[PDB]
Amino acid sequence: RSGIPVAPTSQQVGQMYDLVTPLLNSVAGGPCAIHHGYWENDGRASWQQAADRLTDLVAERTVLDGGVRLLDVGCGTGQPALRVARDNAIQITGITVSQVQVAIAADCARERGLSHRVDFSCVDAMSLPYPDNAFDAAWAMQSLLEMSEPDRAIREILRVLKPGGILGVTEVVKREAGGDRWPTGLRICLAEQLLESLRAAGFEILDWEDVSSRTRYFMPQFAEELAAHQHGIADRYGPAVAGWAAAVCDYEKYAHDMGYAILTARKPVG
Ligand SMILES: Nc1ncnc2c1ncn2[C@@H]1O[C@H](CSCC[C@H](N)C(=O)O)[C@@H](O)[C@H]1O
């Protein structure tokens, strides 16, 4: 029944990422995935490696052939798009509200020799410039819950997908109804609420996988990485970034209530 509970504007979100990007890159050792890792065992792989696994799982579910056009909704620094573009002859349109991320993503594309397959733009997902029925597939890897009006973005994605087009969504969720923003600033949402918003917009749900048991290593491991780079965060990156950093390192107060969802949905055929 209930959908995504519904905040910062898209410009404000872009600004926050403009500010925090250099810190994330520093922690990661370069432009990085900005999503949780997925582990096969008891947390052995680095979070970067585990994040690449998540990317690969999403690509498996969404890139069904060569020669398709894919919209990466909230593309971060473009690292996941470029990972997939290395080995898939497809066209990815990556959109983000952060001009810092656009610039980094486009440079990375150039450096890697992948700009024939991937391009990046500063575009608000709540208002897409694209015609109806433009894309074979889409990703929203931890982007929908950052939006002021996620339902609006979901309807736009449905609009610009072709009939039968596939959407893959990942998100940090409240694992279960037992026991509103997380201390990191992320909107609190159940996977069940995300599903209901997708359905309500007109998507067919193909699959939901609750993978909370595979991703639980992320917050502790990323916090430890962050803590190494924590000196002078407030003076070097600004107080907003310092507040966010403090929240991540405070993960023991809340992360046990978090889980993770991989959703596959499609625009009805026609
Ligand atoms: N309204 C909006 N329109 C487009 N992108 C948005 C948006 N609100 C937030 N985002 C983007 O969503 C991303 C969240 S971080 C996820 C990044 C990427 N999908 C990854 O997996 O690495 C950021 O790039 C942020 O700028």
TrEMBL record:
One GO BP: methylation
Per UniProt, which keywords does this protein have?
A: Methyltransferase, Transferase
Record's CDD domains?
Answer: AdoMet_MTases
Domain Methyltransferase type residues, every copy = 71-167
Q: What InterPro entries does UniProt report for this protein, alphabetically?
A: Erg6_SMT_methyltransf, Methyltransf_11, SAM-dependent_MTases_sf
Record keywords: Mitochondrion included? no
Q: Which Pfam families match?
A: Methyltransf_11
GO molecular-function annotation terms? Answer: S-adenosylmethionine-dependent methyltransferase activity
The record lists S-adenosyl-L-homocysteine as bound by 34-35, 76, 96, 124-125
**PANTHER family, per this entry?**
GERANYL DIPHOSPHATE 2-C-METHYLTRANSFERASE, ZGC:194242
Can you say what this protein is called? Methyltransferase-like protein
Q: Which organism is it from?
A: Saccharopolyspora spinosa
